[PDB]
Amino acid sequence: TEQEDVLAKELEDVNKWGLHVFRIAELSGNRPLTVIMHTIFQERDLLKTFKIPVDTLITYLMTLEDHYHADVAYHNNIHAADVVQSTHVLLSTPALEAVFTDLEILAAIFASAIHDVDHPGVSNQFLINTNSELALMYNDSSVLENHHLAVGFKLLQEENCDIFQNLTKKQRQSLRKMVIDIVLATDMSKHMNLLADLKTMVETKKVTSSGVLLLDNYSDRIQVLQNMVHCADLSNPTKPLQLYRQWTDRIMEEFFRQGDRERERGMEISPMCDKHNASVEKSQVGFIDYIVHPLWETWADLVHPDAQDILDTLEDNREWYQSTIP
Ligand SMILES: O=C(Nc1c(Cl)cncc1Cl)c1ccc(OC(F)F)c(OCC2CC2)c1
Ligand SMILES: [Mg+2]
Ligand SMILES: [Zn+2]
């Protein structure tokens, strides 16, 4: 059909920053995560490398995708698909050429795919404050992140869903550990510590004559993978403005809904969650200035000058958002 043709054409941009992820979600019948992951696995030859039967991969991906909530404005399957594709582009950075093994690539992409699965559309602090079952289960630490991992891994046990069935035991153990390490690092409470280590690595960085990163031990390798997926999670303001604005609309809708739940429970409304007292534009500029730009500038230094175009777009978007403030 014409719909399948236009979808295949859009997917030809899977290696490009600024892929039309919203259009892909529409064209695929709300299956962005499944089609984008499948495309990336085929692009990186991951099915042959890890002997993943195609039917098993699709069955797992559709099940995973079904566990993202369709009524959650931001933390849904579109965001998952976007973080996956963004990580995939970051892994292709010339400064990281041949740095990571196929197993580490698989871990980073899989981690990205499951990193927000079964997100209820409310924050860790909300879950802690409402004496939730999730916060009780996880003792108030990385509540959501622990849950995303548990669900992502548990779904591998469903019928014909074990995409890692042909990995050796050692490969499965290593991948599991890396995935856990990466997803737990998406908790924003760890942002400052991740960034400080990223800066430390930038200052003591070792490279080949072509500017390729030399990372020997697990500690440094996982730190870069952690920061890579963290960057992807925080990549919305670095995308073409048309995409960024859609992400902003979605995060604000999700935040406002949490604020609506807090208001009716008599709780103090969380920062930026009050629809009656919001400054969307100022908050985006502050978000860029204090979180997104410091992180991306540091990432850019690590892979210099490979991330220059991403940094340029971020600064363009910050300038535009600032111009909307009288
Ligand atoms: O925190 C975010 N994401 C997030 C991450 Cl990266 C990790 N863990 C939880 C969340 Cl909510 C997140 C994602 C996108 C945002 O806006 C735009 F880019 F869409 C945004 O605006 C902040 C702002 C209004 C004060 C915030
Ligand atoms: Mg998250
Ligand atoms: Zn996320």
Coordinates of all heavy atoms in Angstrom, one line a residue, residues 41 45 84-85 104 119 166 204 219 283 296 326:
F41 N 18.0 -3.0 14.2 CA 18.6 -4.4 14.3 C 19.1 -4.9 12.9 O 20.1 -5.5 12.8 CB 17.6 -5.3 15.0 CG 17.7 -5.3 16.5 CD1 17.6 -4.1 17.2 CD2 17.9 -6.5 17.2 CE1 17.6 -4.1 18.5 CE2 17.9 -6.5 18.5 CZ 17.8 -5.3 19.2
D45 N 23.0 -5.4 11.6 CA 23.1 -6.8 11.4 C 23.1 -7.6 12.8 O 23.7 -8.7 12.9 CB 24.4 -7.1 10.7 CG 24.4 -8.3 9.8 OD1 23.2 -8.7 9.5 OD2 25.4 -8.8 9.3
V84 N 15.7 5.2 21.6 CA 16.4 4.2 20.8 C 17.1 4.7 19.6 O 18.3 4.5 19.4 CB 15.3 3.1 20.3 CG1 15.9 2.2 19.3 CG2 14.9 2.3 21.5
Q85 N 16.4 5.5 18.7 CA 16.9 5.9 17.5 C 18.0 7.0 17.7 O 19.0 7.0 17.0 CB 15.9 6.5 16.6 CG 16.4 6.9 15.2 CD 16.8 8.3 15.0 OE1 16.3 9.2 15.7 NE2 17.6 8.6 13.9
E104 N 27.8 -4.7 23.6 CA 27.6 -3.4 24.2 C 26.6 -2.5 23.4 O 25.8 -1.8 24.0 CB 28.9 -2.6 24.5 CG 29.8 -3.3 25.5 CD 31.2 -2.9 25.5 OE1 31.7 -2.5 24.4 OE2 31.9 -3.0 26.5
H119 N 5.6 3.2 32.2 CA 5.6 4.5 32.9 C 4.1 5.0 33.1 O 3.3 5.0 32.2 CB 6.3 5.6 32.0 CG 6.8 6.7 32.8 ND1 6.1 7.3 33.8 CD2 8.0 7.4 32.8 CE1 6.8 8.3 34.4 NE2 8.0 8.3 33.8
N166 N 19.9 -17.3 22.1 CA 21.1 -17.8 21.5 C 22.4 -17.2 22.0 O 23.5 -17.5 21.5 CB 20.9 -17.8 20.0 CG 20.0 -18.9 19.5 OD1 19.9 -20.0 20.1 ND2 19.3 -18.6 18.4
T204 N 40.8 14.0 31.1 CA 41.9 13.0 31.1 C 41.8 12.1 29.9 O 42.4 11.0 29.9 CB 41.8 12.2 32.4 OG1 40.6 11.6 32.5 CG2 41.9 13.1 33.6
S219 N 34.4 0.4 34.0 CA 34.0 1.6 34.6 C 33.9 2.8 33.6 O 32.9 3.5 33.6 CB 34.9 2.0 35.7 OG 34.4 3.1 36.4
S283 N 10.7 28.1 31.2 CA 11.1 26.8 31.8 C 11.9 26.0 30.8 O 12.9 25.4 31.2 CB 9.9 26.0 32.3 OG 9.1 26.7 33.3
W296 N 25.2 18.4 27.0 CA 25.6 18.2 25.6 C 26.9 18.9 25.2 O 27.6 18.4 24.3 CB 24.5 18.7 24.7 CG 23.4 17.6 24.5 CD1 22.2 17.5 25.1 CD2 23.5 16.5 23.6 NE1 21.6 16.4 24.7 CE2 22.3 15.8 23.7 CE3 24.5 16.1 22.7 CZ2 22.1 14.6 23.0 CZ3 24.2 14.9 22.0 CH2 23.1 14.2 22.1
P326 N 8.4 37.8 26.0 CA 8.5 39.3 25.9 C 9.4 39.9 26.9 O 9.8 41.0 26.6 CB 7.0 39.7 26.2 CG 6.2 38.4 26.2 CD 7.1 37.3 26.4

